[PDB]
Amino acid sequence: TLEDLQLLADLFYLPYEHGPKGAQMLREFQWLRANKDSEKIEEWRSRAAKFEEMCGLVMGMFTRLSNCANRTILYDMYSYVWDIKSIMSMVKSFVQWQEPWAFRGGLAGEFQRLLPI
């Protein structure tokens, strides 16, 4: 669908600006995070549920995209789609609430640790 790509481009937009949908979604997760007794619990779960709905809209689109006839466009950018799909699963879940690597560089790197720059 058209709307699918609009949401897609919004997540991977420009270096100094995210798209409207991507920025709308980020603002809401950031809001939820910032928030008998006072009735503002009505707005928080109504707003958490409307967000858990958007987390299922974006994830529906992703699955849809992966089933596209053009396997050439998809193979080139899906690695990026697979990352944001994993970061939005644990965001939705958030709302609902060895050894050779750590000593990187090898020989070149070991020498660099003894250098000023």
């Binding site: 669908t1 058209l2 991977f12 937009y13 420009l14 270096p15 193979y75 950018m77």
Partner: protein, 309 residues
């Protein structure tokens, strides 16, 4: 004359010949005209610049320049000898002439010399021969351009290719001073704007370069470039550059995402921007919001057409 198109000049995996041919099809389709071959990690462009092409490599480069010419696309061949060229050695220059001679035998008429991501330090021998870094490149570039019989399209890429790279500033840069004053009028100069990946490219900032380099530059745009971060991709529209910029530039070459297929919006929106003020004299004519609506509309049909990896 205006050179508008793509520059494959990113760090990382270079594009295949198949992708480069389809690109000329898309460029011609969207009324774009230029292609600058500059893969940073294509060993025969940077690292192993001295190394001559093999039969197969020559054959593939021959088929590609043929395809370029066929799709009314200008194929501009670039080379970066800067990481280790000895500017004073006539063996280094003789090598640069042999390699560009081999490339002109492949049907290439347009060329470039890039000195973009290198240190300003010169080896003792070049210090004894040349009075500054800027003189070393200009002397070697002017000799090459003239040697190649002064090709119509000859590009030059400076070390101080953006506002931020200029020491001390753009108007007082002694390096640019020399570039504009001693680099042949027929040789074009690449510029990326105020920074590398520029948020906006003001009309004022271009007037400032145009004065020091003594000409209107060709932009080497990095708005859609994504080699500097593994988790970043750019599918948004060509935004930040006014259409008032076209009557003030010799061209706009976009260095896009490393992933060839992801650049449909990058090149589509670039075509839209150029065509909106294609005949400018001296943003009311272009809307990134709009261009994106049309780029996605046409991209969407592509996802529906079966293609196998």
């Amino acid at each position: 004359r205006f050179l508008c198109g793509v520059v494959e000049g990113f760090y990382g995996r270079p594009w295949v010949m198949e992708q480069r041919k389809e690109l000329f099809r898309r460029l011609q389709k969207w009324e774009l005209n230029t292609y600058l071959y500059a893969p940073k990690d294509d060993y025969k462009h940077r690292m192993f610049w001295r190394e001559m092409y093999s039969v197969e490599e020559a054959e593939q480069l021959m088929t590609l320049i043929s395809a370029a010419r066929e799709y009314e696309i200008e194929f501009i061949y670039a080379i970066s000898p800067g990481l280790d060229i000895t500017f004073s050695n006539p063996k280094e220059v003789s090598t640069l002439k042999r390699k560009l001679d081999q490339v002109s035998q492949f049907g290439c008429r347009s060329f470039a010399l890039l000195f973009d991501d290198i240190d300003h330090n010169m080896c003792a021998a070049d210090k004894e021969v040349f009075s500054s870094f800027a003189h070393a490149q200009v002397s070697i570039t002017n000799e090459i351009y003239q040697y190649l019989g002064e090709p119509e399209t000859f590009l030059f890429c400076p070390t101080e290719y953006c506002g931020t790279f200029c020491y001390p500033n753009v108007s007082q840069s002694p390096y640019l001073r020399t570039v504009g004053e001693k680099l042949l009028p027929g040789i074009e100069v690449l510029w990326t704007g105020p920074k590398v990946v520029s948020k906006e490219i003001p009309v004022e900032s271009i007037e400032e370069v145009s004065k020091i380099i003594k000409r209107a530059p060709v932009i080497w745009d990095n708005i859609h470039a994504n080699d500097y971060d593994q988790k970043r991709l750019f599918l948004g529209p060509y935004k930040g550059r006014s259409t008032e910029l076209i009557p003030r530039l010799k061209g706009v070459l976009t260095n896009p995402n490393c992933e060839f297929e992801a650049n449909y919006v990058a090149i589509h929106t670039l075509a839209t921007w150029y065509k909106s003020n294609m005949n400018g004299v001296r943003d009311v004519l272009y809307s990134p919001q709009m261009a994106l609506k049309l780029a996605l509309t046409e991209w969407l049909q592509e996802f529906g057409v079966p293609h196998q990896y």
